[PDB]
Design a protein around this nucleic acid. Sequence first.
DNA 1: GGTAGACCTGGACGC
DNA 2: GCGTCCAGTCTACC
Length: 314
Amino acid sequence: GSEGHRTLASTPALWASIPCPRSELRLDLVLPSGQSFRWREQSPAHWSGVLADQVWTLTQTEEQLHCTVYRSQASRPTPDELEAVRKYFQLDVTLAQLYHHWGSVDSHFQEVAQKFQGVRLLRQDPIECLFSFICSSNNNIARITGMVERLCQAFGPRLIQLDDVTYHGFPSLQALAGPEVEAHLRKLGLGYRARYVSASARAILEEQGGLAWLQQLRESSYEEAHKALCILPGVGTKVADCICLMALDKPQAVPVDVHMWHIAQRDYSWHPTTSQAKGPSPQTNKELGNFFRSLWGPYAGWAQAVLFSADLRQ
DNA sequence: GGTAGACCTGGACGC
DNA sequence: GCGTCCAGTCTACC
C-alpha cells in the first residue's frame, strides 16, 4: 500500500495533475529515447526517476500528466513542485505549433510526425547532461543507462528507496573529480570513458573556473557554448551538441550520430557537398548539422529528437 | 587540414 | 557455442 512504487490507481490521493494532452507529451517516447538515462517504467505506463533532487513517478491519461513525489508525511506534490515538472518538460513550448511548422517545410517530417506525436525536449541539469553524454559515445542507450545508474549509485547522494530500488541524485563535480574515481568507474564497466569522466571533472573544477563556467554557457551563444565544451576530454562534436540542445537551451543544436546519418541518407537522399569525404568525419558531420538546421529552423534540435525517437522504434 | 585506427562493453546475428 | 558488427573521441601521420 504505502510501500513500493506508487501507481495512479493504488494511492489516488497521492497524485496531482498537470493539464497536458498526449499530443503535447508522450512519456513512452521521451523518457527512454536517449535524452535522459534516469527514468524507468517500474510499473506499466508509470515512469520513476529523479527530478530536481527528488524522486517522482509520472503517468498520463489522454488529457492529463499525473505526478507523485517521494520526499515527512506522504502528501500531494505542491503547486511549486509541479512547476518543477512543467519546467523539466518545458511545457510552455507548444509542441503542436512546432510540429505544424516542421511538417509545413518538410513533407517527410509531416509523414513521420503523424505517428510520433508528443516528442519534446527535456530541460536538463548541465552537470548530469554533461557526464551522461560523455558516457554515450560509441555506445548504446541500454548500456549507457546502466553505466549512468552505477555511476550515480557509487558517487551520488542517496535519496529514497522504493521496493529494492535506491535512488541517487547525480554526482557533484567534486565527487567525480575525487581520487581514484577513474579506477572505480572502470570496475563499474564504463570502459575508457572512465578516464573521460574523471579528466573532465578535474578540468572543469581546476582549469575552467568550476560549475560557474558551465552554467554560464546557458547565456552564451550556441557557437560559443559548443566551442567551450569541446575543450573537455571525451567531449567531441556530438556530445557538445547534446549538451547545448538538452541542457543549455540551444534549440538549434543538432547532435550528429549514426542515426541522423542513416536518416539523412535514407529519408532525404543527403550527401556531403562542401566536403570531399563521402562518410562521417568532422567536416561532413558539421555539414549535416547545418543541413538539418536549414531544413527545420531555430528548433532543429527539437525536430531531430522526433525523427531520432521514431528511428529508434525499429 | 584531413584520415585510418585502436579504444571498453556487451547484445545481436551469422555460420 | 566463438569471432564479428555495432551503438564518437582522440591522435598519429600525410
